[PDB]
Design an enzyme around this catalytic site. Sequence first.
Site, PDB file in Angstrom:
ATOM      1  N   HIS A 108       5.401   9.448   6.602  1.00 41.78           N
ATOM      2  CA  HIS A 108       5.536   8.121   7.185  1.00 41.78           C
ATOM      3  C   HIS A 108       7.022   7.741   7.268  1.00 41.78           C
ATOM      4  CE1 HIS A 108       1.530   6.768   7.991  1.00 41.78           C
ATOM      5  NE2 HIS A 108       1.142   6.752   6.732  1.00 41.78           N
ATOM      6  N   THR A 148     -12.750  10.923  -5.946  1.00 39.95           N
ATOM      7  CA  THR A 148     -14.067  11.024  -6.628  1.00 39.95           C
ATOM      8  C   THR A 148     -14.222  12.222  -7.485  1.00 39.95           C
ATOM      9  OG1 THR A 148     -15.080  12.260  -4.790  1.00 39.95           O
ATOM     10  CG2 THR A 148     -15.184   9.826  -4.809  1.00 39.95           C
ATOM     11  N   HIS A 184       1.700  13.236   3.039  1.00 36.99           N
ATOM     12  CA  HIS A 184       1.280  12.267   4.074  1.00 36.99           C
ATOM     13  C   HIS A 184       2.192  11.021   4.001  1.00 36.99           C
ATOM     14  CE1 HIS A 184      -1.814   9.508   6.157  1.00 36.99           C
ATOM     15  NE2 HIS A 184      -1.022   8.622   5.510  1.00 36.99           N
ATOM     16  N   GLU A 185       2.412  10.555   2.760  1.00 36.25           N
ATOM     17  CA  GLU A 185       3.243   9.386   2.606  1.00 36.25           C
ATOM     18  C   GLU A 185       4.702   9.620   3.003  1.00 36.25           C
ATOM     19  OE1 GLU A 185       1.481   6.975   2.271  1.00 36.25           O
ATOM     20  OE2 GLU A 185      -0.239   7.521   0.982  1.00 36.25           O
ATOM     21  N   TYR A 208       2.596   0.212  13.245  1.00 38.12           N
ATOM     22  CA  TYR A 208       1.416   0.422  12.425  1.00 38.12           C
ATOM     23  C   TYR A 208       0.214  -0.381  12.945  1.00 38.12           C
ATOM     24  CZ  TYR A 208      -0.353   2.088   7.614  1.00 38.12           C
ATOM     25  OH  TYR A 208      -0.997   2.682   6.551  1.00 38.12           O
ATOM     26  N   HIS A 234      -6.667   4.036  10.370  1.00 39.35           N
ATOM     27  CA  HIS A 234      -7.183   5.099   9.551  1.00 39.35           C
ATOM     28  C   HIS A 234      -8.495   5.669  10.119  1.00 39.35           C
ATOM     29  CE1 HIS A 234      -4.477   3.214   6.627  1.00 39.35           C
ATOM     30  NE2 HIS A 234      -4.223   4.480   6.295  1.00 39.35           N
ATOM     31  N   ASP A 270      12.739  14.705 -24.703  1.00 37.80           N
ATOM     32  CA  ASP A 270      12.919  16.112 -24.968  1.00 37.80           C
ATOM     33  C   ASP A 270      12.770  17.043 -23.785  1.00 37.80           C
ATOM     34  OD1 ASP A 270      10.248  15.848 -24.508  1.00 37.80           O
ATOM     35  OD2 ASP A 270       9.672  16.432 -26.546  1.00 37.80           O
ATOM     36  N   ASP A 312      -8.567  -2.836   9.760  1.00 37.92           N
ATOM     37  CA  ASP A 312      -7.650  -1.730   9.506  1.00 37.92           C
ATOM     38  C   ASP A 312      -6.574  -1.680  10.513  1.00 37.92           C
ATOM     39  OD1 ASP A 312      -6.948   0.852   7.956  1.00 37.92           O
ATOM     40  OD2 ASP A 312      -8.090   1.927   9.534  1.00 37.92           O
ATOM     41  N   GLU A 332      -0.746   7.544  11.662  1.00 36.08           N
ATOM     42  CA  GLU A 332      -1.594   8.071  10.555  1.00 36.08           C
ATOM     43  C   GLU A 332      -1.956   9.574  10.712  1.00 36.08           C
ATOM     44  OE1 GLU A 332      -2.093   6.963   7.696  1.00 36.08           O
ATOM     45  OE2 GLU A 332      -1.298   4.975   7.959  1.00 36.08           O
TER      46      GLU A 332
HETATM   47 CA   LIG Z   1     -14.406  14.367  -5.234  1.00 35.02          CA
HETATM   48 CA   LIG Z   2       8.631  14.388 -23.620  1.00 35.88          CA
HETATM   49 ZN   LIG Z   3      -0.765   6.826   6.099  1.00 35.07          ZN
HETATM   50 ZN   LIG Z   4      -2.055   3.911   5.724  1.00 34.80          ZN
END
Ligand SMILES: [Ca+2]
Ligand SMILES: [Ca+2]
Ligand SMILES: [Zn+2]
Ligand SMILES: [Zn+2]
Length: 316
Positions: free
Chosen positions: A146, A194, A142-143, A157, A231, A59, A226, A166
């Site tokens: 990349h 969090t 951010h993504e 990377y 990062h 809908d 990493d 990064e």
């Molecule tokens: Ca938080």
């Molecule tokens: Ca819907």
């Molecule tokens: Zn990244």
């Molecule tokens: Zn990353």
Amino acid sequence: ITGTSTVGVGRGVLGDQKNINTTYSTYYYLQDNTRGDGIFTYDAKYRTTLPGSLWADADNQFFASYDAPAVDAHYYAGVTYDYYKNVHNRLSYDGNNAAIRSSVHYSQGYNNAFWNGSEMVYGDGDGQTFIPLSGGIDVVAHELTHAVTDYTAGLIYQNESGAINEAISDIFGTLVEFYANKNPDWEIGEDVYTPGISGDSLRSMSDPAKYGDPDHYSKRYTGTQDNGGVHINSGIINKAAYLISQGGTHYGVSVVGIGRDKLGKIFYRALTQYLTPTSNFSQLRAAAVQSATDLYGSTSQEVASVKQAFDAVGVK
Ligand SMILES: [Ca+2]
Ligand SMILES: [Ca+2]
Ligand SMILES: [Zn+2]
Ligand SMILES: [Zn+2]
Ligand SMILES: [Ca+2]
Ligand SMILES: [Ca+2]
């Protein structure tokens, strides 16, 4: 899908209502025909096979809780596309209006989001460390950045080039957050991280050490975790970028701020004209200085601030 362009309405992860661009053909699909070759959002249905099914709705109203992450992924990709186009004159990530695809509900309790070389992927989080990651416009941007880096400088990377890659994503993710005026700050992921704890975030650009990341070259991580700390060490560049924009005194070195816009123009130029896949921090400094020089003149304050900022974080 071939159909009629229309506009639907839904509610995002944080409970906010927004309008989204959809396509009608029997069902209403999360397919936005108004930007380049399109923005398409897919349901990965808690699996890891990609991309999943193009999002279909009966809908044109997306108020179900299962809809939330799709609404934000779809919407925030639009905003990011707009930022690049309006601000940098760049059409999509490839500069040629490539379609932007995103999948949501990836896996179960997946606490991450990423660009996989072809599309965006967002986990829903475990509900404790994160809520669905597409609710954070800085994460989405951010993504998507990349992808921009992959088509341009192509920074590998790992090690310093990886930390640069990064930092570039955090810088532009933050610029996009300010562009949309969505309670902007210099923190990364605050809106989806969090949920139980207020005031924290994944990373800080204003004070990386807050969370234990380095804010000076002398403090860089030299191990293997990493991917060589992509990062972690990004904190050094992030701090530099914050200082260039905002100014401040860091380890006794004073930087006059030149503001966000110029920060973005300078970094975009560096990225697109001067960086290469294996560029290191020292190379980034040379790039940023050459870019500011290009844009503002060698005797400009702009050039001066870029220098001070790198000196402040110990990058020579
Ligand atoms: Ca938080
Ligand atoms: Ca819907
Ligand atoms: Zn990244
Ligand atoms: Zn990353
Ligand atoms: Ca924010
Ligand atoms: Ca933020």
